[PDB]
């Protein structure tokens, strides 16, 4: 602690008398407590509040004290103040929130109150475009920090206040009876060229507490669906068709590969050989394209080397397919037969990567997300336990076997594994002694793995399905959002065409004599109750 | 003949229990079997093409034969040694094990779980559909 | 929109005074608003109500206004 000044303590003590007694005789009101106890970090858990007396009073939910601003026997309390990290009062408010119920409620209410008072005192000032050292607006900070409650609040802000209502973000145009149309501001959501809520949320790291649930906010979901239906649906379908055609050509080329030995192979002047070679060339070109695309993704996003292998499985899979193809070419030109092995690996990986495009169809996308989650949790746990069991009993069995074909670890392990797929034998060899021990071991292994663990796997998966519906849907929505953002940034057919939404003059007049246009977005609504 | 015999289910309406059971079967074939068949067929075709490519020459050097042999796994009849005409046995066994793990162990079990969820979810709707069928 | 007559607007505004002031001096009560905004279709989402002042008052849940029927100066 470094700035526990008298007024600081008084505010922390929450008394209306000591604060006033300090206010008289002009107590200083621009002291910054940069004490290590007053900074942000786990060590010596303190309480970060913004570092300014106004910010402290705000974090403490002291509305009564607040409105002391702009009075006499006093010193400036500029709403545009800045701490050692540049955070304002609004930044402090967004920071303190922890997405709880009361906390949300209070924090939003204050945030409002400060907004209205600031507008009243300095209508010519624009708070929310202030930025910190990171250059993030309070809305941007909330979007990048996981605070869903404030995001919902700001993005649906309404202030029906006659003289400075212009700060509101949601508007009502016309109500011709029970059905009325509203407008949502799009400024600093879809296109900013420095920081946009959509781009930030989509590319937010995996550590964000509520990355999935963020897109469920009204405006964001409507905007994403609109962009989809406008142009991304058709662009994505075209890309899917191109990938399918490339895969078909690759499969056809691989299928008819010649069998003579020691490549490369001479090109006979024939139509069939010509088709084979051109298909080869096309497949290698596609591999190069995917390789470069993966490199571009790695360099542009710059993953932090932790999320790299934890998020973006699809990018890794496509890059690995490209690597296999390129290594196959390298070997093919090096006079080695292993190019066949590399080619088949790449072919299988590419074919199984067709699931990627299942996004863009809600049902199949959610199904693919289910498959991911399953492979991540249940298959992993079962595989670990089952492999331990299998190795143990396989070693025991091979030890028991005296000598013969199955006197090797590989053969016995394969034979024991054959049980798991409903193909066990129980008599695959007799070269041993003590048949009772052999049969006991096999029966124990069968009971432990086949009867118990597989059935347990079915039950655990069932529970998983029962548990991850909504999360799967949200993950699918996030995947589609990322696809839309990439496509738009790709310049594939946009070139700043394929516009975003409509423009309107909604206020009529701002506090200044000038009017304004706020790049709004329309969503009609109908309600019977609440006339 | 087969189509006619299997069309005997139509008359299961008029008996509440069996009618609701038939409606369950419809819904299942419509949703779960469809999704699983799509994903599984993609997987099967991919790995079958890879395997046939790997195989050098012999009886199983055709797409149809290899596809059938890979499918035999799904019904508890896989072989894992149905041919040796190739090189690089490690690649072959790796491909077969990956295919087994991905389809047999994972996807079938997932199918069972999804159906269970479906059953848990569509009781009342199934009864209402049966009532509508009887009304028609 | 094609039939946003004075009484139409008054009913849509849900006021008991303007409606009566139009009722006196015999305001017409058989006007049909066949405006494209007053028809049924997704394009330009409006509000279909029946196209008649009585129907409009009904769709708006204006029971108080209703029972004005079968009266004088009407
Ligand atoms: C590493 C290996 C792990 C392979 C299995 C698990 C991953 C997987 O696969 O599922 C996801 C994948 C692509 O999801 P995503 O990129 O979108 O992942 C994330 C994820 O969802 C999360 O929610 C968010 O980060 C974000 O929403 C989203 O971005 O989906 C496929 O590509 C199906 C591919 C399924 C094939 C898996 C096995 C492939 C091996 C083939 C072997 C070939 C023979 C040798």
Residue numbers in the entry:
A (entry chain A): 199 to 603, 627 to 752
B (entry chain D): 545 to 603, 627 to 703
C (entry chain D): 199 to 272
What did the authors write?
The capsaicin- and heat-activated receptor, TRPV1, has served as a model for deciphering lipid modulation, which is relevant to understanding how pro-algesic agents enhance channel activity in the setting of inflammatory pain. Identification of a pocket within the TRPV1 transmembrane core has provided initial clues as to how phosphoinositide lipids bind to and regulate the channel. Here we show that this regulatory pocket in rat TRPV1 can accommodate diverse lipid species, including the inflammatory lipid lysophosphatidic acid, whose actions are determined by their specific modes of binding. We captured several states of TRPV1 ranging from channels in which the VBP is empty to those bearing different bioactive lipids, including distinct phosphoinositide species, brominated phosphoinositide analogs and a pro-algesic lipid, lysophosphatidic acid (LPA). Together, our data show how the VBP accommodates a range of bioactive lipids and how occupancy of the site corresponds to the structural status of the pore.
To visualize the lipid–channel complex, we added LPA to nanodisc-reconstituted TRPV1 and determined a consensus cryo-EM map to a resolution of 3.0 Å. Through symmetry expansion and focused classification, we captured LPA bound within the vanilloid pocket in multiple stoichiometries, ranging from apo to all four subunits occupied. We thus refer to these structures as ‘empty’ to differentiate from the ‘apo’ structures, in which an endogenous lipid occupies the pocket. With resting and fully liganded structures representing closed and open configurations of the pore (S6) helices, respectively, we examined intermediate conformational states associated with substochiometric LPA binding (the four subunits are denoted as A through D in a counterclockwise orientation as viewed from the extracellular face).
